[PDB]
Amino acid sequence: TTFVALYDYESRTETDLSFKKGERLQIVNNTEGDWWLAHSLSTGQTGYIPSNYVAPSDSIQAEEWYFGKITRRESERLLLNAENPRGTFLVRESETTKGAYCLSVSDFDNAKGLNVKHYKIRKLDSGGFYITSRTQFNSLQQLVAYYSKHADGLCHRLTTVAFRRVSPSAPRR
Incomplete structure (x- = not known):
């Protein structure tokens, strides 16, 4: 029932939540189309997060690569x-x-x-x-x-995950 953060975000209002990439969040209310109310499982902070910055835990879109x-x-x-x-x-x-x-x-x-x-x-x-x-x-x-452990048909084994991914545009509401 948990979510995970995909990028870094800084709070713009007094009711939203700042979080870092990889932060595991808990969606406590998703009755809003753009901004959800989440509870950070690591920092213990509660606030509104942009729904496009997160993805379900153990999903395909939640992976770093x-x-x-x-x-x-x-x-x-x-x-x-x-x-x-x-x-x-x-x-x-x-x-x-x-x-x-x-x-x-x-x-x-x-x-x-x-x-x-x-x-x-x-x-x-x-x-x-x-x-x-x-x-x-x-x-x-x-x-x-x-x-990532053995090449096995590939020219080289999978090593580094591609960093430097631009953070998407936060949606307005």
């Missing part, structure tokens, strides 16, 4: 950062196939230099995800936990 409907052009811009080591990755929605996802990872080939590898993740009719038929998965979170 899930970036949503970011385009391929915009996905390479985050991974091509010089700070990102080899293996910096993110999971985006497949713009070609609805319901599918793409995995964009940063890679260093000695022949092409720094580059970005894109692997499309296919959704089974049963609800499963896979990149190759040799290994199938049920959810994207556990898929990342595999390819």
Whole structure:
């Protein structure tokens, strides 16, 4: 029944709540379309939070490496950062196939230099995800936990989560 914060937010009014990314919140009243009343489980503060800054706990949008409907052009811009080591990755929605996802990872080939590898993740009719038929998965979170321990078909193992994600615009009310 808990939620989790996706970004950092600073209080603008006297009735809203300031919170940092990763803060676990408790939605106590969601009878409001834009701003919900939440109780921070870590700092103990209560206040109104923007509903777009949070996502349900153990959901797909709540993961730090899930970036949503970011385009391929915009996905390479985050991974091509010089700070990102080899293996910096993110999971985006497949713009070609609805319901599918793409995995964009940063890679260093000695022949092409720094580059970005894109692997499309296919959704089974049963609800499963896979990149190759040799290994199938049920959810994207556990898929990342595999390819983060061993490469296994990928040019490199998943390492760093892509940081530097702009905070979305707070909705007015």
